[PDB]
Amino acid sequence: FSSRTPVNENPDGVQYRRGFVTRHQVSGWRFVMRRIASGVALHDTRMLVDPLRTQSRAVLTGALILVTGLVGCFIFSLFRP
Amino acid sequence: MSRLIFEHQRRLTPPTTRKGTITIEPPPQLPRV
Numbered sequence: 001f002s003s004r005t006p007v008n009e010n011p012d013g014v015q016y017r018r019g020f021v022t023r024h025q026v027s028g029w030r031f032v033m034r035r036i037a038s039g040v041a042l043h044d045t046r047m048l049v050d051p052l053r054t055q056s057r058a059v060l061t062g063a064l065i066l067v068t069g070l071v072g073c074f075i076f077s078l079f080r081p
Numbered sequence: 082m083s084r085l086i087f088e089h090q091r092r093l094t095p096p097t098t099r100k101g102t103i104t105i106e107p108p109p110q111l112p113r114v
Contacts, residue, residue, distance in 0.1 A: 001109035 037052055039045045 002106050004106065 034050060034053055035045060035047055038047060038050055041052060
């Protein structure tokens with residue numbers, strides 16, 4: 001339900017400096033960064049499909065396959081005689 | 082009882098108060114089950 005943040009009308013109140021980074025903020029930053037990257041490498045900003053994110057995901061999936069096979073053969077060496 | 086005259090000019094405006102009724106959105110209802 002409630003989501004708001006009215007304007008503070010008190011001059012003697014508290015002002016919240018030194019903000020952190022929210023999950024929302026970091027997601028928005030990652031999005032705008034992927035959008036700039038798309039607009040630079042390609043000439044798309046409509047972002048209907050992002051092949052760059054797919055490529056990065058592909059390389060990281062390769063890395064995950066790597067580390068998974070590694071730990072798998074490791075525990076295989078240990079458990080088996 | 083005075084031997085001197087006083088003249089009534091515009092009253093110095095007080096600090097401006099307003100009657101803006103502040104409305105508060107009710108608490109969120111608990112998860113409807």
